[PDB]
């Protein structure tokens, strides 16, 4: 049995703009949902600007990108995933002409990656929609936001047609059902049906993402535009059929989104979920054909852990087989890693064997799924450089191969230090997985 990955396997790492860039008020950039969520997406927003918001400065990737990308190339990154800040291109979100200072920055960022022959993997919207679209239109429950996103998608497609070939429309559309403010820009007014508004926004997100696939293929002929779901691999606690159906239903909570994005239609099991609840979804004629004629090219997904219904490296092999068996389309692991507390030794090093073990075991199981015949484009671990966490807007939960001197209260020199996992991953990419 081979120990090497497929040739051309896209090794690398993944971040999001609002989690590393900083410079939140530079170059005319508008306020995003992250800019008013100083305690993470999992906690209520706050527009007072009275508390410390680590997203405002991040790790200053906006100013330190040349050194950080040089560190990604030192590990031999074949690909690098990040997001284009929607607010940098459209501060309020509904402008007719884009912001030239925002587009020029991503010219410099994408040029820097291509200096080291690193493939950019660009998420178009990643938990950072303009706050102006929330106050003006009410978020993704308004059909006008589709036009703003399509305009935004078309703008970045034409601007980077020669530089970016791998795109993802939305990062985890399902987030609209768990954090409606970040997922779809929603707040529930008096008497407003909550489930209706969320699934109404999910439909607009579905249609807007399909329009971006159509626009992306038209503007960039060789582009591969993919979806992004957070894998919810769930095992039944007991062999009782009620728990087997429970695990199946929890897995369907995410497969519904990849069903619409990859297969092109609302699956049948959603007709009764909408009926047995009070959920009615206003739908325009021709939306069904837009969803079906512009399915995504690949299925990007994240994986961190298994779940039960009543740390797991083998579960990522189950997830890869389950997704590929259902859709028969190329997959892409776009987020995976271990968040943990780092300790800087007296000599300045970081001995993160705990993070090496997680990544090594999960990649050994990824190689097994490839041996099972799964079509996998690449693997970008989450936050190759320490970033501000999405859930709580913190630094203590570190994912990186590179340590950033910044703590939860914003203190620190912001210097970068190679962890022990930095050199371990450098050898993994060098041997194409043979050193695992």
Number of spatially distinct domains: 1
CATH topology: TIM Barrel
Strand portion, in percent? 5-15%
| CATH homology superfamily | Glycosidases
Based on CA inertia axes, which overall geometry fits?
Answer: globular
Q: What is the count of helical runs?
A: 15
Going across the major beta sheet, what is the strand order? 1-2-3-4-5-7-9-10
Gyration radius from CA atoms, angstroms: 21 Å
Straight-line distance between termini: 14 Å
| Count of distinct strands | 12
- Which structural class should the secondary elements be placed in? alpha/beta
CATH class descriptor: Alpha Beta
Could you give a short account of the major beta sheet? Answer: 8 strands, parallel, barrel
Secondary structure: elements and pairs:
Layout: E1 10-14, H1 17-20, H2 61-74, E2 79-83, H3 86-89, H4 100-115, E3 119-125, H5 131-137, H6 144-159, E4 166-170, H7 175-178, H8 180-184, H9 194-219, E5 224-230, E6 234-236, H10 241-263, H11 269-276, H12 287-293, E7 299-302, E8 307-309, H13 313-327, E9 331-335, H14 353-371, E10 376-382, E11 402-404, E12 416-418, H15 420-430
Helix pairs in contact: 2-4, 6-9, 9-12, 13-14
PDB class: hydrolase
Keywords: GH1, hydrolase
Assembly: monomeric
């Amino acid at each position: 049995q081979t120990k090497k990955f497929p040739e051309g396997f896209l090794w690398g790492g993944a971040v999001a703009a609002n989690q590393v860039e900083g410079a939140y008020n530079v170059g005319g950039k508008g306020l995003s949902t992250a800019d008013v969520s100083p305690n993470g997406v999992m906690y209520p927003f706050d527009e007072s600007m009275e508390s410390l918001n680590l997203y405002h400065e991040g790790i200053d990737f906006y100013h330190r990108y040349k050194e950080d990308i040089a560190l990604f190339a030192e590990m031999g990154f074949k690909a690098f995933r990040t997001s284009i800040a929607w607010t940098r291109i459209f501060p309020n979100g509904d402008e007719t002409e884009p912001n030239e200072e925002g587009l020029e920055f991503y010219d410099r960022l994408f040029d820097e990656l291509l200096k080291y022959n690193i493939e950019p993997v660009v998420t178009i919207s990643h938990y950072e929609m303009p706050l102006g679209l929330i106050k003006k239109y009410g978020g993704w429950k308004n059909r006008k936001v589709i036009d703003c996103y399509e305009h935004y998608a078309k703008t970045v497609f034409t601007r980077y047609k020669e530089k970016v070939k791998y795109w993802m429309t939305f990062n985890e559309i399902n987030m609209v059902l768990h954090a409606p403010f970040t997922g779809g820009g929603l707040v529930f007014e008096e008497g407003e049906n909550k489930l209706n508004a969320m699934y109404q926004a999910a439909h607009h997100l579905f249609v807007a993402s399909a329009l971006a696939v159509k626009a992306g293929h038209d503007i960039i002929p060789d582009a591969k535009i993919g979806c992004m779901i957070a894998a919810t691999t769930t095992y039944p606690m007991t062999p009782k059929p009620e728990d087997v159906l429970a695990a199946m239903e929890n897995e369907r909570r995410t497969l519904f989104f990849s069903d619409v994005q990859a297969r092109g239609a609302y699956p049948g099991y959603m007709k009764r979920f909408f009926k047995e609840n009070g959920i009615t979804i206003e739908m325009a004629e021709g939306d069904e054909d837009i969803l079906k004629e512009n399915t995504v090219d690949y299925i990007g997904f994240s994986y961190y852990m298994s779940m039960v219904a009543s740390i797991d490296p083998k579960g990522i092999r189950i997830t890869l087989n389950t997704l590929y068996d259902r859709y028969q389309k190329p997959l892409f692991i776009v987020e995976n890693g271990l968040g943990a507390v780092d300790v800087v030794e007296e000599d300045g090093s970081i001995q993160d064997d705990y993070r090496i073990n997680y990544l090594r075991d999960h990649l050994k199981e990824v190689r097994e799924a490839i041996a099972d015949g799964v079509d996998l484009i690449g693997y970008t671990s989450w936050g190759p450089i320490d970033l501000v966490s999405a859930s709580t807007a913190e630094m203590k939960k570190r994912y990186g191969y590179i340590y950033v001197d910044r703590d939860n209260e914003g203190k620190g020199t912001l210097s970068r230090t190679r962890k022990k996992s930095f050199y371990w991953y450098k050898k993994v990419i060098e041997t194409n997985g043979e050193s695992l």
